[PDB]
Every structure is written in C-alpha cells, then in structure tokens.
Amino acid sequence: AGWRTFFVDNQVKTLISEALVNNRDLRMATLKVQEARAQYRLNASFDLDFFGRLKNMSEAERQNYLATEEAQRAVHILLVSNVAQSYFNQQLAYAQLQIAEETLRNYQQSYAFVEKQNVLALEQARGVIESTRSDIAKRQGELAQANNALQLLLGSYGKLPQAQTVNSDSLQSVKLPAGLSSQILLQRPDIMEAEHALMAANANIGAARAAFFPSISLTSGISTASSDLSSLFNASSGMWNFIPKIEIPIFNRQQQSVVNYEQKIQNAFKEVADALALRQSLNDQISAQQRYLASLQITLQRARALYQHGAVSYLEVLDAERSLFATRQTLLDLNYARQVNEISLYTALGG
Amino acid sequence: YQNAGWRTFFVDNQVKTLISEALVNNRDLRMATLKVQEARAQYRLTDADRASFDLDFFGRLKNMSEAERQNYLATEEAQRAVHILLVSNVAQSYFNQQLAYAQLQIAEETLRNYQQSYAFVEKQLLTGSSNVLALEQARGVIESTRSDIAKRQGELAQANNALQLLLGSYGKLPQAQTVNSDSLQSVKLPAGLSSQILLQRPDIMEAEHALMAANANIGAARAAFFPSISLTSGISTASSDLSSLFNASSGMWNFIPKIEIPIFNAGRNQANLDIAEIRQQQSVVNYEQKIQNAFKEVADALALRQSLNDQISAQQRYLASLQITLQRARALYQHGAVSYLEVLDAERSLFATRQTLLDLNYARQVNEISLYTALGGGHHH
Numbered sequence: 044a045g046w047r048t049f050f051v052d053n054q055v056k057t058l059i060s061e062a063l064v065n066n067r068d069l070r071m072a073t074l075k076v077q078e079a080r081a082q083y084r085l086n087a088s089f090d091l092d093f094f095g096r097l098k099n100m101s102e103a104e105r106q107n108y109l110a111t112e113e114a115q116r117a118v119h120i121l122l123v124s125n126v127a128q129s130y131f132n133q134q135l136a137y138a139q140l141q142i143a144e145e146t147l148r149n150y151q152q153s154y155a156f157v158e159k160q161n162v163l164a165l166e167q168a169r170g171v172i173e174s175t176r177s178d179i180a181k182r183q184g185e186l187a188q189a190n191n192a193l194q195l196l197l198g199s200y201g202k203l204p205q206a207q208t209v210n211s212d213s214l215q216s217v218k219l220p221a222g223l224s225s226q227i228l229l230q231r232p233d234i235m236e237a238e239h240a241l242m243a244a245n246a247n248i249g250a251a252r253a254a255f256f257p258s259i260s261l262t263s264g265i266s267t268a269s270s271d272l273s274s275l276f277n278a279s280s281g282m283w284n285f286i287p288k289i290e291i292p293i294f295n296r297q298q299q300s301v302v303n304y305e306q307k308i309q310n311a312f313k314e315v316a317d318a319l320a321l322r323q324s325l326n327d328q329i330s331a332q333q334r335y336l337a338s339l340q341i342t343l344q345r346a347r348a349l350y351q352h353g354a355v356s357y358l359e360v361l362d363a364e365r366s367l368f369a370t371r372q373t374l375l376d377l378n379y380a381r382q383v384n385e386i387s388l389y390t391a392l393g394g
Numbered sequence: 395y396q397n398a399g400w401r402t403f404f405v406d407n408q409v410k411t412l413i414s415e416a417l418v419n420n421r422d423l424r425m426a427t428l429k430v431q432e433a434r435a436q437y438r439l440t441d442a443d444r445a446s447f448d449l450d451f452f453g454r455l456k457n458m459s460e461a462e463r464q465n466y467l468a469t470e471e472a473q474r475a476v477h478i479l480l481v482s483n484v485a486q487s488y489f490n491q492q493l494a495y496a497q498l499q500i501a502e503e504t505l506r507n508y509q510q511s512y513a514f515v516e517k518q519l520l521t522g523s524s525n526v527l528a529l530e531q532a533r534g535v536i537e538s539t540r541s542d543i544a545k546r547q548g549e550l551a552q553a554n555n556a557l558q559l560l561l562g563s564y565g566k567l568p569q570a571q572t573v574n575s576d577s578l579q580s581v582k583l584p585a586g587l588s589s590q591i592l593l594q595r596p597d598i599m600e601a602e603h604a605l606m607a608a609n610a611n612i613g614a615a616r617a618a619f620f621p622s623i624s625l626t627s628g629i630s631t632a633s634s635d636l637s638s639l640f641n642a643s644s645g646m647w648n649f650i651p652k653i654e655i656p657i658f659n660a661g662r663n664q665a666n667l668d669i670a671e672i673r674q675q676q677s678v679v680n681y682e683q684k685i686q687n688a689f690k691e692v693a694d695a696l697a698l699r700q701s702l703n704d705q706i707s708a709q710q711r712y713l714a715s716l717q718i719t720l721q722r723a724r725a726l727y728q729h730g731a732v733s734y735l736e737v738l739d740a741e742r743s744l745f746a747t748r749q750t751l752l753d754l755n756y757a758r759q760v761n762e763i764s765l766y767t768a769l770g771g772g773h774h775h
Binding site: 068070071074075078082102105106148183187188190191194195198199200201 | 642704707708711712715716718719722723726729730731732733736740742743746747750
C-alpha cells in the first residue's frame with residue numbers, strides 16, 4: 044500500500060482508498076480506467092503498455108494473465124495512478140477556470156475604461172473578452188471530463204470534491220526516504236514478469252539478481268537522486284554504465300530472458316532517474332515562480348495605493364493584475380506537471 | 395391573439411396541447427382561479443391526511459373583499475394574471491406527471507435489478523459463497539424499492555388529479571412520453587430581446603394603472619424609470635446590458651433614473667395638494683420598485699437556466715460513459731470475463747445517474763415556467 048505513504052495530499056488518498064474498495068473485480072477496473080481515458084481522445088506509457096499488451100492477446104490469454112500476481116500488481120498501480128491523475132486534472136481545471144473568470148472580469152473593466160476615454164484598441168478588448176469567455180467554456184468542459192473520470196474510477200454516488208485551495212503547501216512533493224534501496228524496483232510488474240521468464244528458462248534468481256541488478260541507494264542524504272544512481276549513467280553520454288559480473292552461474296528461452304532482464308532493469312533505473320531529476324527541476328521552477336508571484340502581489344498593492352492618490356491610470360492597476368493572473372497560471376501548469384511526474388515516480392517505483 | 399406567448403415559448407408539443415385544452419375549458423376567470431387553487435390543494439394533500447407568483451396572487455385575492463375581488467378581476471392586469479396562472483399551472487402539473495412516470499419507470503427497473511441480485515446471492519449462499527447479512531441487505535433494498543414505487547405511484551396520481559382539474563371532464567391525460575437523453579436542453583430565446591416585453595407583466599401593468607390614476611404622463615414615467623435595454627445576448631443568455639444593471643457581487647441595482655420631462659403636472663391645485671402628491675409619490679416609488687424586481691427576476695432566471703444547462707450537460711456525459719461501460723461489461727460477461735453481479739452493479743450506476751438527470755431536467759422545466767412568468771407571458775413582441 045505504498046500509495047498511502049507516497050501521496051501527501053489527504054483528499055487524493057481518500058479518493059484512492061474509496062476506489063480500492065469499489066474495485067474488487069480486476070477486469071471491471073480495467074474497463075473503468077479505459078473509459079476514464081478514452082473520454083478525452085482517440086505521457087502514461089505504463090497505461091499504453093498495459094492496454095496494448097492486453098489487447099494483443101486472446102480472451103483466454105487475458106483471463107489467465109489477470110490471475111498472475113504481476114497483473115494484479117499492475118492493475119493496482121493502474122487504478123491508483125489514474126484516480127490520482129483524474130483528481131489533479133480536476134483540481135487543475137477548477138483553478139484555471141477560476142483564474143479565467145477573474146481574467147474575464149479584469150478585461151471587462153479594461154474595456155469599459157477604454158471606451159469612457161481608439162476603436163482599434165476598443166475592439167481588441169472585445170476580441171480577448173470573447174476568447175476568454177470561450178476559454179472559460181473549454182475549462183468548464185475539462186472539469187466535466189475530470190469529474191467523469193473520477194465518478195467512473197470510483198462509483199455512482201456523485202459526491203465529487205470541490206476546489207481545494209491547498210496551495211503554497213502541496214505545491215511541493217513527498218520527501219523521499221534518504222537511502223531508498225534500489226531493490227524497491229523488484230516489485231515492478233515488468234521486472235516481476237522478467238523474473239518469471241527467468242524461472243522459465245531454468246535460471247537461479249538469486250544469481251540473476253546478484254549479477255545484473257545493482258544494489259544501491261536511489262536517493263541521497265536529502266531525497267534527491269543519489270550519487271550512486273547518477274554514476275550508472277555516463278555523463279554527457281547519458282548511457283547505462285553497469286558491468287554485470289557473473290560469479291555464481293545463472294542457470295541450473297534462455298539468453299532472451301537475460302537480455303529482457305538487463306533491458307527492464309536498465310530502463311527501470313532510467314525511469315527513476317528521469318523522475319528524480321525532473322522533480323528536482325520542477326521544485327526549483329515552482330519556487331522561483333513563487334518568489335516572483337510575491338513580487339507581483341506587492342507591485343499590485345503598491346499600484347492600488349498610487350491609483351488612490353491619482354498617481355497612475357486605472358489601466359495600470361488592471362495591467363498589474365493581468366501579470367498576477369499570468370503567473371498564477373504558470374504556477375498552476377508547473378505544479379500540475381510536478382504531480383504528473385510524481386505519478387511517474389510512484390509508477391516507476393512500482394507501487 | 396395573446397396565445398402567441400405560450401405557443402412560441404413552450405417548445406414541447408404535448409404541453410402545448412394541454413395548455414390549449416385548459417384555456418378552452420376555462421373561459422371564466424373566477425372559475426379558473428378555483429380550479430387552480432384546488433389543483434394545487436391536493437398536492438398539499440400529503441400533509442392534511444396524516445411558486446412565489448401563485449402565493450402573491452392568491453394571497454392578494456383573499457386579502458381583499460368580495461366587492462374588491464370582482465372589480466380587480468375586471469381589470470386588464472388581472473386577466474393577464476389569470477392567464478399566466480392557468481398556463482403556468484398546467485405546464486407545472488404536466489412536468490410533475492412526466493417526472494413521476496419517469497421516476498417510476500426507473501424504480502421498477504431498479505426492483506428487477508435487485509431481484510436478480512437476490513436470486514444470485516441466494517444460489518451463491520447455498521454453494522457456500524456469501525454472507526447471510528448479504529441476503530438481508532438484498533431483501534431490505536427490495537422492500538424499500540417497493541416503497542418508492544408506491545410513493546411515485548402516489549405522486550403520479552396527484553399530478554393526474556391536478557391535470558384533470560385544470561383540463562376538465564373531456565381532457566385526455568398523456569401517457570408516459572418516453573425521453574431522449576440527448577434532447578434535454580431548453581427553448582433558445584430570441585436574441586436581443588427588448589426589455590419592453592416586461593411592460594406586459596401584470597405587476598407592472600398595475601403599477602402603470604396606478605400611475606394613470608394619479609395622472610402621470612406614462613410616456614414620461616417610462617422614459618425616466620424603465621431601462622430600455624436588450625435582455626438577451628447574441629444567443630439565449632443574459633446580455634451585458636442586463637448584467638450591468640446590478641452592481642457586481644452586491645446584487646444592488648445601478649440604474650439612476652433621470653427625469654427630463656415632469657411626470658406629473660403641478661396638480662389641479664388646492665385639490666388636496668399634499669395628498670395628491672403623496673399618491674403621486676407612492677405610485678412612483680411603487681413603479682420603480684416593481685421595475686427593479688422584474689429585472690432581477692429575469693436575471694436570476696437566466697442565470698439559473700445557464701447553470702442547470704451546464705449541470706445537465708455534465709450528467710449526459712457521465713451517462714454516455716456509463717452506457718458504454720455497461721455494454722462492454724455485458725459482452726465481457728458473455729465470455730466469462732466478469733461476474734453477473736458486476737453487470738448488475740454497473741446497471742445500478744446507469745440508474746442513479748438517470749435519476750439525477752431527471753431531477754435536473756425537471757428543475758430546468760420549473761425554471762422555464764419561472765422565466766415565462768417573469769417575462770409576463772412569453773417573449774412575443
């Protein structure tokens with residue numbers, strides 16, 4: 044139940060728990076997730092992999108596969124990650140919608156002010172007032188879609204969450220355990236499967252693990268990527284470094300399963316490393332935006348005062364407020380991309 | 395004419411048939427007042443056996459003497475009021491009827507669904523698969539579902555009653571008009587709808603009558619006090635003119651009347667100068683207060699309309715996904731890929747969502763009736 048300790052936000056944990064209760068039947072869960080995603084269009088490569096692989100097998104093969112433990116772990120991961128994803132989408136939409144509405148208000152005072160005092164300028168204000176109103180209906184629809192996804196993943200009773208103001212706080216990720224054992228990744232279903240294949244080619248998993256799976260810490264003394272993890276991918280090259288050493292012979296179908304293994308292993312470590320760097324990188328971006336935002340807030344406060352003393356036109360206050368709105372949106376995109384990356388991470392670690 | 399208001403407002407043909415029939419059977423205004431009172435009475439039957447417009451109208455009437463009542467019912471605004479009362483009430487009762495037919499249809503579908511899941515949980519049990527409290531649960535929800543079937547059946551009868559009363563002895567009550575889930579939106583109103591339409595409200599007709607009793611220049615009073623804007627935008631939404639009549643997040647009213655021409659002559663002089671002024675002042679303050687309120691009502695109705703539209707649109711989307719998910723679950727069941735109970739659970743989701751959609755649609759219809767009322771009997775010129 045890694046989900047419980049991985050997602051900080053308590054609402055998304057409520058949602059996940061609820062979805063876990065209602066999704067006893069594995070095949071049904073597969074349906075719900077499929078419809079929650081299909082309702083959008085025609086990353087989530089974990090999803091693409093899973094559905095494609097499932098759709099390329101006979102019905103009899105599917106029912107067998109969903110009995111294996113790796114499939115039940117995969118589906119659990121699919122369910123949890125999709126609920127969390129649906130929620131972030133919902134929260135993203137409430138917030139972009141909320142900013143577009145304040146934006147619409149601002150632009151409408153900006154219109155009325157201009158006319159009171161060019162017609163070229165006046166009609167540009169009619170241009171954005173509309174594309175802002177069309178934007179509003181766009182976000183209204185994304186909201187409906189996220190809501191659709193959430194009802195589906197859970198159950199009938201339409202008690203959805205409202206706009207969580209939980210910002211300036213859940214703007215940042217879970218602190219990862221310092222010294223997290225790379226052996227967490229043996230619980231990835233892709234790696235679990237690779238080892239079943241190893242057992243099929245008559246191999247000793249112990250020696251297979253010893254020879255090919257590096258035992259390291261994934262995180263540093265902080266919660267950042269460990270120096271060990273970085274040292275597995277040649278700088279500038281960005282390519283896997285590890286040389287497997289065969290002490291104990293691996294075997295008691297064959298040299299396919301070993302290369303499958305080395306390929307899954309190297310990629311799992313790569314997914315974790317990308318996730319760690321991106322997460323760290325998004326931290327920095329968000330934090331800078333946040334400091335910028337505060338500088339905009341006082342600028343608007345100060346512009347508000349000046350206007351009261353006749354020192355600037357009202358349009359200056361409106362422009363100061365547009366800047367504030369522009370940054371709040373950027374924050375929101377960045378944060379959202381953080382949450383999507385967190386889900387990548389959770390999935391990469393395998394539950 | 396003047397049937398033009400409801401004929402061009404209510405988009406549903408069946409309801410337009412019923413309205414037309416009730417008008418024919420109610421040629422006498424006082425009797426229609428009776429039939430409406432009594433049609434409303436026997437909904438309130440649910441508590442004597444164990445709309446702001448109608449309250450205002452009926453309240454107004456009992457507060458007067460019988461001589462006053464007969465005088466009022468001979469005025470132009472009263473005939474207008476009785477027209478709208480009769481139209482709005484026939485519409486309401488029909489929607490009630492269709493609501494009940496619909497809630498009933500779902501409740502019976504639900505009952506069959508719970509019976510099939512009872513028959514499964516029992517076969518399960520005697521093959522050592524279920525809890526005995528599971529059987530208990532199944533039996534409870536069936537019993538309470540039989541209760542609802544009886545309750546909806548009660549409400550259907552209350553609405554049929556109300557309809558027969560408004561329609562008369564020879565009126566045919568409609569059967570269940572089965573609903574298309576993709577045609578649940580409202581009548582698109584004319585664009586640029588003139589505020590002048592509001593002068594046909596009974597309350598405003600009365601205000602102007604009082605104005606003329608105190609010898610106002612009506613033209614002058616209208617120019618001074620009645621905003622001459624458009625009510626609707628390029629579509630079917632509250633226009634910006636309408637919106638700007640109310641202070642943003644106060645609800646407070648922004649129109650400042652400016653009197654260019656005096657509304658009242660300097661009196662016939664010494665004919666109770668300070669008393670005629672009083673009556674003059676009263677009719678003015680009253681006109682102005684009826685106007686703000688007429689505009690507010692329409693604004694609120696247009697907003698409620700927009701909102702319900704969004705909510706319905708969202709339910710229709712949830713439903714389409716539930717429908718696809720059910721078909722897929724049924725096919726999977728046919729391949730042994732899922733339990734029969736999973737299909738029944740999926741069907742129950744479809745049912746709940748259908749009920750929510752019916753509630754929403756009904757609130758949409760009550761709001762149309764409200765709009766039609768607020769406008770003063772349609773949006774026809």
